[PDB]
RNA sequence: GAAAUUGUUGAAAGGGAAGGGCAUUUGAUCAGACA
RNA sequence: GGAAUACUGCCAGCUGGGACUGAGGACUGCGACGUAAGUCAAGGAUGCUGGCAUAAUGGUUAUAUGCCGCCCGUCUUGAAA
RNA sequence: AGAACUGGCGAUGCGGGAUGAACCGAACGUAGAGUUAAGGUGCCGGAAUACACGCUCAUCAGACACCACAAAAGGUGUUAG
RNA sequence: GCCCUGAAAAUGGAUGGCGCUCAAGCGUGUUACCUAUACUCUACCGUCAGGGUUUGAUGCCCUGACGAGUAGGCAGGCGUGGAGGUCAGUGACGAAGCCUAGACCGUAAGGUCGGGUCGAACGGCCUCUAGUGCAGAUCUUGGUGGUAGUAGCAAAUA
RNA sequence: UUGGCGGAAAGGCCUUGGGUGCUUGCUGGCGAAUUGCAAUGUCAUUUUGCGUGGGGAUAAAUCAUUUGUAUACGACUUAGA
């Protein structure tokens, strides 16, 4: 894996863009404000910008609400990974491992 | 006369032309899927001869249409002719190979009167 | 005059290729005097005309066109991938093409 | 019978389409295309001419003028696209240019009313033209890449 | 560009000189290299006979003559090294090739055009000063070649009857530019200037 | 090495005329018929 | 009156086999559609 | 002491060029601009024009050209062997 | 030759390792456009005969994991300690 | 550290090849670029599933996800001989069969057509039944090639 | 057409004299449309054939026979109005 620590930036552009929702299983793309209310309206998180903020604040649903976003399909960097050869570190050059706040302009270049 | 169709799309225009019915005579075009334990065209090695398979299967919206946009259908005479005569749009009639040049002509003409299309409207013609 | 010519010259390279696999669907012209990515920008949707002659007439000409576009640039060095209706026949690799200079943004 | 026959048969009725929404906004011209410009026709019968440009038109085309007296190019329709836009301008302010439209070419040799319309509008270009001096010979003559044009670097 | 290029063969080095001109072949472009017999390869003299000594011993076993044809011809070295370069078996190999011309010298035609150079070939751009090279014929004689000192006395006879011309070349350039500084402060002139030109 | 003409005498034996022929007795033995035309003048084809 | 296989006519291609896949040019040849 | 600029990031800032795609087919939904009546790029392409109306597109076929393709069946850890 | 855990090959193509059952990459319905992986970008060959600091001259130079080998021991070759 | 020496094998040969020497080598840094059946988006196919809906209800409709496979299992289908039923089915104005780099439907097994040859029977559908589908078994019977106008047709005096 | 130079594959270069076409060096008088807003919009050179007529030219080799400086056969070498 690469992770980090995602910036409002792109947790927004996540879940505007790529986010989805489990309902009944079936994936469904979210669009529509009142797809969130439906399911997570139990919480509270009636917005979309309701979600982020569960996500970003990591309020006390996070569970639910983050279990509630299918998870993310990616690209490929768009402006391709950097680096030659991907599974080392990091630290070593590689792509993997914890890049911290870095793991934003990959997601977005993923984005 | 046709329907309105989509495009109609193929996927595969070539014939699955079973591997080796061009080496050996005794090989029938016929496809046939090979079950050796060696065979590269089981295994699928680059270079080989493509597969049948469910993915090429065309289109619903499109399927069973000639190029025409009828489902063709085949009459051996009148009254065979005749149930197409609702749907006219829909399905042509193809004249079967073994019906008597004389009656031809006869569903030829109900043909015509109905708006009918015949696909083989031709065959056994005196000309 | 002497000069008539309202397209820049360029010649068809390859097809779109890995080592081993190419791709008919889709080739690799190189433009005359253009050596950027940055200079080929100009080109793309710009259109193509490869020019073959025949033996047989038959809109009334013996001379017959294939007609493409530049889709993109191709790497460092300023060639160019275009794509066309029917793709060319790779007896073409180093043929002469026209890109000519329309649709115009100028 | 030789084929059995279909327990179900389509619909043939033909339903209406779905009410789309696409508007028909206007086309912006791009910067260059200023009536007065000076043109060069990229394709067409008149490919290679230097051509005046005068109204851009209902049906997105661009009136142009040769003018006709000069390069032999009549009051035509042209492509946006199909056309570089020199720099060098001619002051337009004394053509009519209003009488033309779509209709005014409708397909339905030469009628008498657009002889007199060219003669026309080429009196009022052909005296801007005079202002400037080699620009009546300079549109007669006809444009063409010479070995060593590179159009991504060209000036016009 | 050209419908022909005529290339200069003196001190450049084979291997890039070569892949410059493979591509120009498999591009479409027509290349033909002369004084061939004056390229360059890196490397001192010795190595590089050692080096053609190894090619030497290599041939097929049982008939030595379907084996490895070995060209001791300044201009063949050369294609040789070209060849190797170009999908020869392929048909689209057979048209480049055919594209191409080398010679050693300069012979008819050629010698009344111009010929260009390739920068990126050019040994005096290429190799760092003080490493050694060697020159071809010089390699290609000691392998057998005959014919060294008959380049060398028709080059000898060429370069004079060039010098000829490019003597009265110079003395009329001359007079053009005599003309052409009367022309200079007229009124074209400065009109001229003052576009570029 | 190569050679760029010959010159041949006017007259030519009817020895070697027989060596440019498969069959003597057939032919109408035209060899070096024309070629001894380059004489009739003061040969300067010949000299040249 | 099939196939192996063979004669003649027609066409085509062939620089140490032939055959295949993708794709187009070219030759040939054809369906459909429209009205 | 006062700035500039680099560097990193942010914008629900504005905008040019190019490529591929147009599934669906009355209406129904979420909205958006409007004082309004209306309008829209808001639950999937329409508007304008030209050419041809025929082997032109296409199918098929032989062939040439680019790249790729080793004899199948079998037993076997392993088969072009 | 023979055990332990796991991943594989066998039963499996695809991209890279020229080539190769097991390595790297990544696993397979028919297509299109985009972007990448492993590996590469003088020419064969798609892709910088790109930029940058050095080292290296071999009368057997050297050149990329698995991988298709080399050692003890020497050099007043040159380099930096 | 790089280089030299230490370093001997049998057909002619392999950094993959050409070739490269301020590299096209070695160590390291930065970009840009090339392209997998992988990743993203959309079309189509199939499979599984979750809904909706009394006129093919074994139906229609909405929605999402998935798709490698030898040995092997299950499924839905394609074709052959014969049987029960049907279409008052095709046919001497030409059945069946054969031929055909002609045309059409299907992913496919297959199905349909035109033209040729032909002569006396035969097909769709819903079911029934089995001596039901071949490339091979040094398979059985028959038939035919290449080898090939070849080996050869020379003991016994003519 | 005058004269010269060029054998590396010269087959090309250079020069003299008159005839003749163009000249955008400069200044006039006309023409250009309807190919319909694009459609390579056809302008190159390759070989070949068939006719008209303008120069020019009027042979060989093979089988068969024959030699033996030759020979398995083909081939080789000779001979014959
Ligand atoms: C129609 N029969 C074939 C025909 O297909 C064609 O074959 C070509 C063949 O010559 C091509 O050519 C090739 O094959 C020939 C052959 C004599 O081996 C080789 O000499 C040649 O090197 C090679 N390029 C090959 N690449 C494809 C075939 N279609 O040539 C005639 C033929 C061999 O009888
Ligand atoms: C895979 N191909 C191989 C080929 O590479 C070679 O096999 C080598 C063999 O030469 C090696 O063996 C030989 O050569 C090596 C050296 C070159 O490593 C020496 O160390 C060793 O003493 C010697 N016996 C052995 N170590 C591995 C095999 N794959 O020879 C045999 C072969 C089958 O052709
Ligand atoms: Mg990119
Ligand atoms: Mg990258
Ligand atoms: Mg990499
Ligand atoms: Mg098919
Ligand atoms: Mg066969
Ligand atoms: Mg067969
Ligand atoms: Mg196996
Ligand atoms: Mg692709
Ligand atoms: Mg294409
Ligand atoms: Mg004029
Ligand atoms: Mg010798
Ligand atoms: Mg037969
Ligand atoms: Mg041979
Ligand atoms: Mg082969
Ligand atoms: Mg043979
Ligand atoms: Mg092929
Ligand atoms: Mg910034
Ligand atoms: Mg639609
Ligand atoms: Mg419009
Ligand atoms: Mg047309
Ligand atoms: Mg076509
Ligand atoms: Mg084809
Ligand atoms: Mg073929
Ligand atoms: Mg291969
Ligand atoms: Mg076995
Ligand atoms: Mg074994
Ligand atoms: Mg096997
Ligand atoms: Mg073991
Ligand atoms: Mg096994
Ligand atoms: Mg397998
Ligand atoms: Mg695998
Ligand atoms: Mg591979
Ligand atoms: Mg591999
Ligand atoms: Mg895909
Ligand atoms: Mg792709
Ligand atoms: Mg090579
Ligand atoms: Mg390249
Ligand atoms: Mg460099
Ligand atoms: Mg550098
Ligand atoms: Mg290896
Ligand atoms: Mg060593
Ligand atoms: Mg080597
Ligand atoms: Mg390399
Ligand atoms: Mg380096
Ligand atoms: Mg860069
Ligand atoms: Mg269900
Ligand atoms: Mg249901
Ligand atoms: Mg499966
Ligand atoms: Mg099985
Ligand atoms: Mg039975
Ligand atoms: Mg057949
Ligand atoms: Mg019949
Ligand atoms: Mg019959
Ligand atoms: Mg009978
Ligand atoms: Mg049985
Ligand atoms: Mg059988
Ligand atoms: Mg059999
Ligand atoms: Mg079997
Ligand atoms: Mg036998
Ligand atoms: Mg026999
Ligand atoms: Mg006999
Ligand atoms: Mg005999
Ligand atoms: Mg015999
Ligand atoms: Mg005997």
Redesign the pocket.
Same mark, same amino acid.
């Given at each position: 894996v690469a992770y980090g620590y995602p910036?409002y930036?792109?947790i927004?552009?996540l879940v505007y863009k790529?986010g989805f929702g489990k309902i009944?299983?079936?994936?469904?793309?979210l669009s529509?404000?009142?797809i969130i209310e439906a399911n997570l309206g139990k919480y509270g998180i009636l917005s979309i910008?309701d979600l982020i903020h569960e996500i970003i604040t990591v309020g006390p649903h996070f569970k639910q609400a983050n279990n509630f976003l299918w998870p993310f *399909?990616?690209?490929?960097?768009?402006?391709?990974?950097?680096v030659?050869? !991907?599974?080392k570190h990091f630290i070593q050059?590689g792509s993997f491992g914890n890049r911290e706040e870095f793991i934003?302009?990959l997601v977005?270049s993923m984005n | 006369?046709?329907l309105p169709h989509?495009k109609?799309?193929?996927?595969?225009?070539?014939?699955?032309?079973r591997?080796?019915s061009?080496?050996?005579?005794?090989?029938?075009?016929?496809?046939?899927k090979? *079950?050796?334990?060696?065979?590269?065209?089981?295994?699928?090695?680059?270079?080989?001869?493509?597969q049948?398979?469910?993915?090429?299967?065309?289109?619903? *919206?499109?399927?069973?249409?000639?190029?025409?946009?009828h489902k063709?259908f085949?009459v051996?005479?009148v009254?065979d002719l005749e149930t197409l005569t609702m749907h006219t749009k829909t399905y042509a009639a193809?004249?079967?190979?073994?019906?008597?040049?004389?009656?031809r002509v006869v569903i030829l003409a109900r043909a015509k009167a109905l708006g009918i299309?015949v696909? +083989?409207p !031709?065959?056994?013609?005196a000309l | 005059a002497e000069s008539h010519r309202?397209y820049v010259k360029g010649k068809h390279?390859?097809?779109? /290729?890995?080592? /081993?696999?190419?791709?008919?669907?889709?080739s690799?012209i190189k433009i005359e005097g253009v050596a950027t990515?940055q200079d080929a920008?100009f080109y793309?949707?710009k259109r193509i005309?490869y020019?073959?002659? =025949?033996?047989?007439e038959? /809109?009334?000409? @013996?001379?017959?066109?294939?007609?493409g576009?530049?889709?993109?640039?191709?790497?460092?060095?300023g060639?160019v /991938?275009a794509?066309f209706?029917? +793709?060319?026949?790779? !007896?073409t &690799?180093g043929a002469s093409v026209?890109i000519?200079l329309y649709?115009s +943004?100028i | $019978?030789?084929?059995?026959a279909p327990?179900?048969y389509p619909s043939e009725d033909v339903?209406? #389409?779905?009410?789309?929404?696409?508007?028909?906004?206007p086309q912006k011209l791009?910067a260059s295309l200023v009536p007065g410009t000076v043109l060069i #026709?990229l394709?067409?019968?008149?490919?290679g001419k230097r051509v005046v440009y005068l109204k851009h038109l209902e049906?997105?085309?661009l009136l142009i003028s040769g003018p006709?007296?000069?390069?032999?190019?009549?009051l035509?329709?042209? +492509?946006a696209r199909?056309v570089i836009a020199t720099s060098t301008k001619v002051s337009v302010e004394g053509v009519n240019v209003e009488k033309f439209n779509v209709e005014y070419?409708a397909? %339905?040799?030469?009628?008498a009313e657009?002889?007199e319309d060219?003669k026309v509008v080429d009196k009022a270009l052909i005296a801007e033209i005079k202002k400037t001096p080699l620009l009546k010979?300079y549109l007669?003559?006809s444009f063409s890449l010479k070995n060593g044009d590179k159009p991504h670097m060209l000036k016009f | 560009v050209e419908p022909v290029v005529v290339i200069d063969g003196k001190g450049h080095?084979?291997?890039?000189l =070569?892949?410059?001109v493979?591509?120009q072949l498999?591009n479409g472009q027509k290349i033909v290299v002369v004084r061939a017999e004056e390229l360059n390869? $890196?490397?001192?003299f010795?190595?590089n006979k050692?080096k053609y000594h190894?090619?030497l011993? @290599? =041939?097929?076993? &049982?008939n030595k003559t379907?084996?490895?044809f070995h060209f001791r011809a300044p201009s063949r070295?050369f294609y @040789?090294?070209?060849?190797?370069?170009?999908?020869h078996k392929?048909?689209?190999?057979k048209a480049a090739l055919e594209r191409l011309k080398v &010679? %050693?010298?300069?012979?008819?035609?050629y010698?009344?055009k111009k010929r260009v150079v390739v920068p990126?070939?050019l040994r005096v751009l290429?190799?760092?000063?003080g490493?050694?090279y060697t020159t071809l014929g010089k390699l290609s004689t000691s392998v057998g070649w005959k014919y060294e000192d008959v380049?060398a006395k028709?080059?000898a006879?060429?370069k004079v009857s060039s010098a000829e011309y490019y003597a009265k070349k110079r003395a009329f350039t001359k007079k053009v530019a005599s003309a052409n500084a009367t022309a200079a402060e007229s009124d074209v002139a400065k009109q001229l200037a003052a576009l570029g030109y | 090495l190569?050679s760029?003409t010959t010159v041949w005498a006017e007259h030519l034996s009817d020895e070697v005329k027989?060596r440019?022929? *498969?069959?003597?007795?057939?032919?109408?033995?035209?060899?070096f018929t024309?070629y001894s035309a380059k004489y009739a003048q003061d040969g300067a084809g010949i000299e040249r």
């Open positions: 910036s930036s792109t927004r552009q790529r009944n299983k079936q994936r469904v793309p529509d404000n009142a910008d *399909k990616l690209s490929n960097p768009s402006g391709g990974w950097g030659p050869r !991907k599974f050059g934003n302009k977005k | 006369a046709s989509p109609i799309v193929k996927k595969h225009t070539k014939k699955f032309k591997h080796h061009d080496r050996y005579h005794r090989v029938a075009e016929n496809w046939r090979q *079950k050796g334990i060696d065979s590269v065209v089981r295994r699928r090695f680059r270079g080989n001869i493509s049948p398979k469910i993915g090429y299967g065309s289109n619903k *919206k499109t399927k069973f249409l000639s190029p025409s946009g063709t085949l051996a005479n009254k193809e004249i079967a190979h073994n019906i008597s040049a004389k009656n299309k696909t +083989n !031709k065959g056994r013609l | 309202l390279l390859s097809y779109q /290729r890995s080592k /081993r696999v190419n791709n008919p669907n889709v690799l990515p920008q793309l949707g005309a020019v073959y002659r =025949a033996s047989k038959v /809109r009334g000409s @013996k001379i017959r066109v294939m007609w576009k530049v889709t993109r640039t191709h790497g460092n060095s060639v /991938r794509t209706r029917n +793709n060319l026949p790779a !007896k &690799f026209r000519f649709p +943004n | $019978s030789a084929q059995k327990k179900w339903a209406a #389409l779905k009410k789309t929404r696409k508007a028909a906004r791009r #026709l394709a067409g019968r008149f490919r049906d997105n085309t006709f007296k000069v390069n032999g190019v009549p035509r329709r042209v +492509n199909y070419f397909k %339905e040799e030469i009628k657009r002889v060219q010979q007669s003559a | 080095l084979v291997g890039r =070569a892949s410059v493979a591509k498999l390869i $890196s490397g001192e010795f190595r050692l190894d090619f011993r @290599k =041939a097929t076993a &049982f379907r084996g490895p070295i @040789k090294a070209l060849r190797g370069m170009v999908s392929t048909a689209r190999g &010679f %050693e010298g300069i012979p008819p035609p010698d009344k990126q070939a290429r190799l760092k000063p490493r050694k380049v028709l080059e006879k060429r | 190569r760029l027989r440019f022929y *498969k069959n003597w007795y057939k032919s109408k033995k035209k060899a024309k």
